[PDB]
């Protein structure tokens, strides 16, 4: 079972200058509670953006050139990245945009964070067909001190 997990502000924007333009601690905490204790696959750009291994998670990184970090696994094809993860209930594609474009067909589950926000961005979440996806869960939170914008977690299922 392969899952994508992301945070999309309006017009499906996911990043700007190899960052996420928002800082929502409750999103980074959602992301953790779900990804924790399971393989995470990511692109090199995103590995740099994060720029540290995520504890708990076996970190697996997609790049066509040799690895520059010994404490994470490095891989060159989609299948190599899957095999890396092992025999597990659930895999977690944690980004970025070019990775999501490739891992959606094999995906059976989405974890979106819908963000009530208008940001400029260079990177977009793919265009998922709201037919082939069934919303199995939703949860809206208001803007608070730390969480500058309102947001809503959604899980979908193929
Ligand atoms: N919550 C969110 O919305 C979220 C989560 C993650 C990412 N982001 C944002 O998304 C953006 C990432 O943009 P991006 O799409 O350029 O990042 P990316 O997906 O991290 O970068 C993909 C890179 O991974 C490698 N790669 C991917 N598939 C490969 C394959 N099949 N074979 C070989 N190498 C492969 C390539 O690196 P090589 O050049 O080394 O070959 C490729 O350039 C950033 O702005 C980031 O902040 C935000
Ligand atoms: C733990 O920190 C990061 C996590 C992520 C991945 C990620 C984070 N949140 C959500 N909802 N989906 C994701 N795929 C992406 C990041 O930068 C692009 C991070 O650095 C702040
Ligand atoms: N919007 C929905 N309720 N879709 C139903 C799920 C469709 C399913 N993913 C096919 O295959």
Residue numbers in the entry: 1 to 158
What does the paper say about this structure?
Crystal structures of EcDHFR:TMP and EcDHFR:NADPH:TMP, determined to 2.5 Å, and 3.0 Å respectively, show that the binding affinity of TMP is driven by electrostatic interactions between the protonated diaminopyrimidine ring and Asp27 as well as van der Waals contacts between the trimethoxyphenyl ring and helices B and C (specifically, the side chains of Leu28, Phe31, and Ile50). Furthermore, the antifolate adopts a nearly identical conformation when overlaid with chromosomal DHFRs from other prokaryotic species, including Gram-negative (Coxiella burnetii)57 and Gram-positive (Staphylococcus aureus)46 organisms. Accordingly, when we titrated TMP with a preincubated binary complex of EcDHFR:NADPH, a highly cooperative binding event with an apparent KD of 11 pM was detected (>2000-fold difference). In the presence of TMP, the KD for NADPH shifted ~100-fold to 8 nM, demonstrating a marked enhancement in cooperativity. The additional methylene unit in the side chain of glutamic acid results in a 1.4 Å reorientation of the carboxylate head group, subsequently pulling TMP further into the active site by 1.1 Å.
Two plasmid-encoded dihydrofolate reductase (DHFR) isoforms, DfrA1 and DfrA5, that give rise to high levels of resistance in Gram-negative bacteria were structurally and biochemically characterized to reveal the mechanism of TMP resistance and to support phylogenic groupings for drug development against antibiotic resistant pathogens. Trimethoprim resistance in Enterobacteriaceae occurs almost exclusively through the acquisition of plasmid-associated dfr genes that encode intrinsically insensitive DHFR enzymes. Expectedly, all three enzymes form the stereotypical DHFR fold with an eight-stranded β-sheet, four α-helices (B, C, E, and F) and three catalytic loops (the Met20, F-G, and G-H loops).
